[PDB]
Coordinates of C-alpha atoms in Angstrom, one line a residue:
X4 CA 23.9 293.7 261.4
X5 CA 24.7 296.3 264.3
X6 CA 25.5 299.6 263.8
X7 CA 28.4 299.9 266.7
X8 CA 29.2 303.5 265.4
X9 CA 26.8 306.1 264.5
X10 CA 26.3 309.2 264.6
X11 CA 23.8 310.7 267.3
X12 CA 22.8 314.3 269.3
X13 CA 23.7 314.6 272.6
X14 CA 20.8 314.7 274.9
X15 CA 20.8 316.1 278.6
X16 CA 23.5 316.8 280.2
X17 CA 23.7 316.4 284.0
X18 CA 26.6 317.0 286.5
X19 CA 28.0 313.8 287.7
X20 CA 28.4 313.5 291.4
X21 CA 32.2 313.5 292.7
X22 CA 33.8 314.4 289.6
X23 CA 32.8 318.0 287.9
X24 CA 35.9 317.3 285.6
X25 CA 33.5 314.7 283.9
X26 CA 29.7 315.0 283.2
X27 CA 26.9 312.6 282.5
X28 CA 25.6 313.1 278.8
X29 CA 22.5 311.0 277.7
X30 CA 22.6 309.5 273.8
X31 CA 19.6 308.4 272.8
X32 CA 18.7 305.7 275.6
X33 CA 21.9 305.5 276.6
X34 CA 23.9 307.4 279.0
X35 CA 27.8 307.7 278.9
X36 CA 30.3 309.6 280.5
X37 CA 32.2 312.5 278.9
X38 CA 35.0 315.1 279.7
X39 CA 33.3 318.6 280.6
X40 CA 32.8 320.9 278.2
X41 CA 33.2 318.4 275.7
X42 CA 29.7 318.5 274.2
X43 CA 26.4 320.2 275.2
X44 CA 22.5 319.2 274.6
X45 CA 22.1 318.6 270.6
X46 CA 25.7 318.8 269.3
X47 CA 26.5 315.4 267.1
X48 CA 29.3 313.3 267.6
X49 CA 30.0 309.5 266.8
X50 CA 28.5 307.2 269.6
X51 CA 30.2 303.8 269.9
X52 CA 28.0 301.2 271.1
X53 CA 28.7 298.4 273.8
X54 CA 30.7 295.3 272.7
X55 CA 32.8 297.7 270.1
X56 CA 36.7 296.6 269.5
X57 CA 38.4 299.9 269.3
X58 CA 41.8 299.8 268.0
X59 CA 44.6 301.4 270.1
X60 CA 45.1 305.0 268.7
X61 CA 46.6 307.8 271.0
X62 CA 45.8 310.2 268.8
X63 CA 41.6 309.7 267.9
X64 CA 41.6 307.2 271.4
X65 CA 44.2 308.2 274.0
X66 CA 41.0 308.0 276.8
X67 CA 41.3 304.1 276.2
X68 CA 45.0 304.0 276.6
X69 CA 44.4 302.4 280.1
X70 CA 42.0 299.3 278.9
X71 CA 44.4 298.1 276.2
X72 CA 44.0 294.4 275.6
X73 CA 44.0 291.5 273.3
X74 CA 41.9 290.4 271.4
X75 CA 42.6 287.9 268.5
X76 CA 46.5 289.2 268.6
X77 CA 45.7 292.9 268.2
X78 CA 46.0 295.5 270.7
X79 CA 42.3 297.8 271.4
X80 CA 39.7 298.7 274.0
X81 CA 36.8 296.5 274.8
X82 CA 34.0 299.3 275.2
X83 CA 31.5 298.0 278.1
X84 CA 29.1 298.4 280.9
X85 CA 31.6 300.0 283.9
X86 CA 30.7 302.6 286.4
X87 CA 33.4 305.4 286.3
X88 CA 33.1 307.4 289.8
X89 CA 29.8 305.8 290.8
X90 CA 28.1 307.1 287.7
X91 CA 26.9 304.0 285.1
X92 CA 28.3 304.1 281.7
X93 CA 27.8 302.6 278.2
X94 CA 29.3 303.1 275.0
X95 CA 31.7 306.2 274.2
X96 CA 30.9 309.5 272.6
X97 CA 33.5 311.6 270.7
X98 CA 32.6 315.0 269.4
X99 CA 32.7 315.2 265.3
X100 CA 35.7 318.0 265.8
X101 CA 37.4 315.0 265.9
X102 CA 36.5 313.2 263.0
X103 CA 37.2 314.6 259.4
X104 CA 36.7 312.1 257.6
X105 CA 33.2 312.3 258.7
X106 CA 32.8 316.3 258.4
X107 CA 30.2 315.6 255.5
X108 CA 27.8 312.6 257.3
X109 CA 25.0 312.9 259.0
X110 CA 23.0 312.0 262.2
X111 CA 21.9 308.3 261.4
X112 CA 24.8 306.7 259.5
X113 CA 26.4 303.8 260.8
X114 CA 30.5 304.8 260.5
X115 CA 31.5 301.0 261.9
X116 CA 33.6 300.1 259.0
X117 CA 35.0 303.1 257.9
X118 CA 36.0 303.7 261.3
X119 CA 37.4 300.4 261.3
X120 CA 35.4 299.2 264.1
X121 CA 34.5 295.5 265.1
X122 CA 32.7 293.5 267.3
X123 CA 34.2 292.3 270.7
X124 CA 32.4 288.9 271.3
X125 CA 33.4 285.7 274.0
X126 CA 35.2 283.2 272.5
X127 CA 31.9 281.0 271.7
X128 CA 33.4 277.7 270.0
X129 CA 32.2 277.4 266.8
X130 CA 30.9 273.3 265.2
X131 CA 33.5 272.3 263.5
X132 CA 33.8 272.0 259.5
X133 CA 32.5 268.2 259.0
X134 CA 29.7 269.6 260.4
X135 CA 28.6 272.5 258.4
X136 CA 26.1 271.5 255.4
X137 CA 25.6 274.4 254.5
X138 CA 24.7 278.1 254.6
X139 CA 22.9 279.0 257.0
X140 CA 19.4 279.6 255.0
X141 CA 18.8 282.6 252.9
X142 CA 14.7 282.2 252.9
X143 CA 14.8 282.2 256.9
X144 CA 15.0 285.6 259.1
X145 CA 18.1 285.9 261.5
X146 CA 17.2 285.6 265.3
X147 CA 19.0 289.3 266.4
X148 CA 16.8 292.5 267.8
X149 CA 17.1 295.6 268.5
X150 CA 18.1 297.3 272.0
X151 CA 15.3 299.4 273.6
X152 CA 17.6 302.1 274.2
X153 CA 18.2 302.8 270.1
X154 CA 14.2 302.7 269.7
X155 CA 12.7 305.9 271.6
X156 CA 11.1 307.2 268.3
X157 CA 9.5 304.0 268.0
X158 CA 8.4 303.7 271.8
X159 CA 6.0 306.9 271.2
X160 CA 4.9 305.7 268.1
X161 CA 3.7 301.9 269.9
X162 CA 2.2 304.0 272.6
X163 CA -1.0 302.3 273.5
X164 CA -0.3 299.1 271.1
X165 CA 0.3 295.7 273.2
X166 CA 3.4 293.3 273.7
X167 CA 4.4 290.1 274.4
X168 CA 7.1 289.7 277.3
X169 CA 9.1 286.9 277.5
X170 CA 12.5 286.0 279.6
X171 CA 15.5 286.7 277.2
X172 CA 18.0 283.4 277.8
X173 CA 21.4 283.4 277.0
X174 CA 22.3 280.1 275.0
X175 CA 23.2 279.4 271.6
X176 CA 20.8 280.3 269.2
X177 CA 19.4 277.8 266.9
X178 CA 17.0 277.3 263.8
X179 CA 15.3 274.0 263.4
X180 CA 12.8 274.1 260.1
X181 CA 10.9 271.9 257.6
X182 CA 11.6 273.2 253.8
X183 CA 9.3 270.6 251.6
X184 CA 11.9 267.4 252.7
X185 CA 14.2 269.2 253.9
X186 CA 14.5 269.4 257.7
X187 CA 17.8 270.9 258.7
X188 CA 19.4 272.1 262.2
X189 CA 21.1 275.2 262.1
X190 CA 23.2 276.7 264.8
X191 CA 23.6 280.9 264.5
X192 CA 25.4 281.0 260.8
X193 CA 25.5 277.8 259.9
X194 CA 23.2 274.5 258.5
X195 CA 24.4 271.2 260.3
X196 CA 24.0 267.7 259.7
X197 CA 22.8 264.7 261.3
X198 CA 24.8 263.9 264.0
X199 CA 24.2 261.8 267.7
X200 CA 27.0 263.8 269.0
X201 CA 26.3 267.4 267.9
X202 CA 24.5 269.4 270.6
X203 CA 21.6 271.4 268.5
X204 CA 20.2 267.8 266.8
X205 CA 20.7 265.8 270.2
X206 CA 18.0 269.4 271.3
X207 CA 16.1 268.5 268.2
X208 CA 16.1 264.7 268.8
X209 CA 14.5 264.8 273.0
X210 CA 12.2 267.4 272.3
X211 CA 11.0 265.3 269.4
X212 CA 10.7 269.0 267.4
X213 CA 11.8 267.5 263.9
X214 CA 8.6 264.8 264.0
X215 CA 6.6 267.6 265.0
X216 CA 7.7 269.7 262.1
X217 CA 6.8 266.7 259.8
X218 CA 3.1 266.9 261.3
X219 CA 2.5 270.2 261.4
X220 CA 3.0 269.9 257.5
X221 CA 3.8 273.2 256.7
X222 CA 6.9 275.1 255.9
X223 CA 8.0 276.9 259.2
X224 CA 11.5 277.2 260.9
X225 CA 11.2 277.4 264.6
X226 CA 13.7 279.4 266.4
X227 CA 15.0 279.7 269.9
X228 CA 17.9 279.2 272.3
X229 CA 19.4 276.3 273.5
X230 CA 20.5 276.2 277.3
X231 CA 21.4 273.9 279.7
X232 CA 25.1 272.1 281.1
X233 CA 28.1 272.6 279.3
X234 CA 26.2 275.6 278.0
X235 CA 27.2 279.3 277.6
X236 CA 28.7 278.7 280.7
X237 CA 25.1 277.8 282.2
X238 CA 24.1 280.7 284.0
X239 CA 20.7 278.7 284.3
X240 CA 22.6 276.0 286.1
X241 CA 20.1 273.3 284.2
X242 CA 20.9 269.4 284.1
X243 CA 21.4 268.5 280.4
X244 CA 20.4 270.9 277.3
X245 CA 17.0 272.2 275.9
X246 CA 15.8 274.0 273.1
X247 CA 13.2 277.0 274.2
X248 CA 11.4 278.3 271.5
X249 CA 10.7 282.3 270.7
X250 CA 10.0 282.5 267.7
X251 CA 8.4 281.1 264.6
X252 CA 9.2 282.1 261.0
X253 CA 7.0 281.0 258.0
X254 CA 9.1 280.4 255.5
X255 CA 5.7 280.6 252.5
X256 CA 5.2 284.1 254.0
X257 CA 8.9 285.1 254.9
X258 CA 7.1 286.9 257.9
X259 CA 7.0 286.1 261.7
X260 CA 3.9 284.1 263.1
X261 CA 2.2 286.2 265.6
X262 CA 2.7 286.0 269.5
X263 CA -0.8 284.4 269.7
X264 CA -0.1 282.0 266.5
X265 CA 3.1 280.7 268.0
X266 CA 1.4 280.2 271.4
X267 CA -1.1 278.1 269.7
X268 CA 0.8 276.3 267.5
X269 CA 3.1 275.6 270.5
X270 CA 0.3 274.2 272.2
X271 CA -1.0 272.3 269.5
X272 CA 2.7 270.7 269.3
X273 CA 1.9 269.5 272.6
X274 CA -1.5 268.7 272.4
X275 CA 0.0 265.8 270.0
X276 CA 2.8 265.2 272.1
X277 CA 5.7 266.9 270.5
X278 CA 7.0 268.6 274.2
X279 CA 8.9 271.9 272.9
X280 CA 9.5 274.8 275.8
X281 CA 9.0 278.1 275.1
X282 CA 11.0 280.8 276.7
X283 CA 9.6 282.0 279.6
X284 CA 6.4 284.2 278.9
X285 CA 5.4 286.9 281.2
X286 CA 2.4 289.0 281.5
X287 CA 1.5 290.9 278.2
X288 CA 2.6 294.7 278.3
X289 CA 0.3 297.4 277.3
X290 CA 2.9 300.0 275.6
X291 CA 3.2 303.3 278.4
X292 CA 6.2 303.4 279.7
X293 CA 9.6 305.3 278.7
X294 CA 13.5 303.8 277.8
X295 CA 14.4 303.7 281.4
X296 CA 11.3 301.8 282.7
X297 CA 11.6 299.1 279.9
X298 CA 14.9 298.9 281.8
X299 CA 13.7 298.9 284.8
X300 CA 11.0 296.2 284.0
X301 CA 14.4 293.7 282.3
X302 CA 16.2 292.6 285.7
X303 CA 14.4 290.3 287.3
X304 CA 14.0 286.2 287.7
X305 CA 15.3 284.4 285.2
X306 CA 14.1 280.5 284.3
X307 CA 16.0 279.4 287.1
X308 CA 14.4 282.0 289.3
X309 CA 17.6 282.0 292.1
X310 CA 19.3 283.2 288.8
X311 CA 18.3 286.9 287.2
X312 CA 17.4 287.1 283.8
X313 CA 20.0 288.6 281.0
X314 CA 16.6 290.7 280.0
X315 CA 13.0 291.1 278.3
X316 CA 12.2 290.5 274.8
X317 CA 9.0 292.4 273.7
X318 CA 7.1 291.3 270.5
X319 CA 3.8 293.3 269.6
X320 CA 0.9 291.4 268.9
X321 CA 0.7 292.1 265.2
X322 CA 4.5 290.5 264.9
X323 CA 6.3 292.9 263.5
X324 CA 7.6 295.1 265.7
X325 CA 9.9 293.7 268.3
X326 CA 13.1 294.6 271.0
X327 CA 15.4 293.6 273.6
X328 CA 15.9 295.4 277.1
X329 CA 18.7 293.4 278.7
X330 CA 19.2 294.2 282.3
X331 CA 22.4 296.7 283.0
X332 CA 22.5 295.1 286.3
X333 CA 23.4 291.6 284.2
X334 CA 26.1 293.7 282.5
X335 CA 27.3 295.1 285.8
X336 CA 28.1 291.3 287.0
X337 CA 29.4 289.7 283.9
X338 CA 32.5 290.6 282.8
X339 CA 32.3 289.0 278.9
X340 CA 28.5 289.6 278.4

């Protein structure tokens, strides 16, 4: 689960155009605006990521006192991609002056709840409760990654080593999987039942996934959005819905199946018939680039190529190192996103 609040150093700090009241100070792979003077290269202070609720406070927040809004009947700032005097902007950092509480934490801790901090998200409608079975399952992995620009450690240390690129689409995410008998649809938190009417199981029915499951004759959950009409708002603009796959869990191993596995096995679904898409892969990436070209590299043409993507996922070969790099020029059009 995200850590919307940490605590991070302040990396370079460079005049911002227009304004010299404000300055441009890098965090991590980020960059955010703050007041002059406010912090210089390596001082700490609590970074709140994208998508963070803040609740109103004049006191520890009076800079958001002029995005106060709703959400869920409480009064707070939606944190999110803006540009503020022509300069781009994500997330907000606070010097730790400011924050007693937190006088004896350190660089790395995630201070989301005891900062009181939640997660802004669009009001996705949930399946209703005659349609929950269950959990969702505790012996399958959760579909979320990590964003490139909280990774630059790691970027050095996968110099050299080799990825898998594939279109990130925005849809629901769902989990259909074969546990001995049981074969079970799950949306993002929950396990649903049968239904003709429910969305995810009408995916599993076309694509004939569930059959394919049962032939394969193993254990694996197969994991991967669901797009289409009546979806997400359908950015893609696609007739109807469809389950793309990205990635496969084995459920025996509790690890991911390789890039190069799942490609296959993909395949040899549809070598027997069973026709389930895959997101959209792109050319393998041999690891040399830094935070901003990943960036650079996640705009671009989406499945419906007169549509551009949300962003890249990047999976190394070995399986078990992966990220995100969603395109800030996605964020810069979407208002909820």
């Amino acid at each position: 689960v995200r850590k919307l609040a940490t605590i991070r150093t302040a990396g370079e700090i460079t005049p911002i155009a227009g304004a010299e009241a404000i300055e441009c100070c890098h965090v991590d792979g980020w960059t955010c605006v703050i007041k002059k003077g406010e912090f210089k290269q390596g001082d700490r202070g609590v970074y709140f990521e994208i998508d963070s609720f803040i609740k109103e406070d004049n006191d520890r927040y009076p800079m958001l006192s002029k995005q106060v809004i709703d959400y869920e009947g409480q009064r707070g700032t939606r944190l999110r991609t803006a540009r503020l005097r022509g300069q781009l902007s994500q997330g907000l950092f606070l010097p730790m002056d400011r924050f007693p509480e937190l006088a004896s934490n350190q660089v790395g801790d995630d201070v989301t709840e005891i900062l009181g901090i939640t997660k802004w998200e669009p009001p996705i409608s949930t399946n209703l409760s005659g349609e929950i079975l269950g959990e969702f399952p505790t012996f399958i992995s959760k579909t979320d990654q990590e964003r490139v620009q909280n990774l630059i450690p790691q970027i050095e240390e996968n110099k050299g080593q080799k990825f898998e690129v594939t279109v990130k689409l925005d849809g629901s995410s769902m989990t259909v999987y074969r546990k001995d008998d049981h074969i079970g649809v799950c949306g993002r938190n929950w396990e649903l039942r049968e239904t003709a009417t429910n969305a995810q199981w009408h995916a599993a029915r076309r694509n004939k996934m569930i059959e394919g499951l049962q032939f394969l004759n193993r254990n694996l959950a197969l994991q991967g959005e669901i797009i289409g009409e009546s979806i997400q708002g359908n950015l893609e603009k696609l007739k109807g819905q469809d389950f793309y796959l990205f990635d496969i869990y084995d459920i025996d191993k509790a690890q991911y199946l390789t890039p190069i596995e799942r490609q296959s096995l993909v395949k040899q679904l549809n070598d027997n018939g069973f026709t389930v898409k895959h997101v959209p892969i792109l050319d393998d990436l041999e690891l040399n680039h830094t935070a901003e070209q990943i960036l650079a590299m996640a705009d671009g043409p989406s499945l419906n190529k007169n549509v551009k993507r949300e962003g890249l996922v990047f999976k190394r070969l070995d399986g078990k190192f992966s990220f995100k790099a969603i395109s800030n020029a996605y964020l810069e059009k979407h208002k909820d996103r």
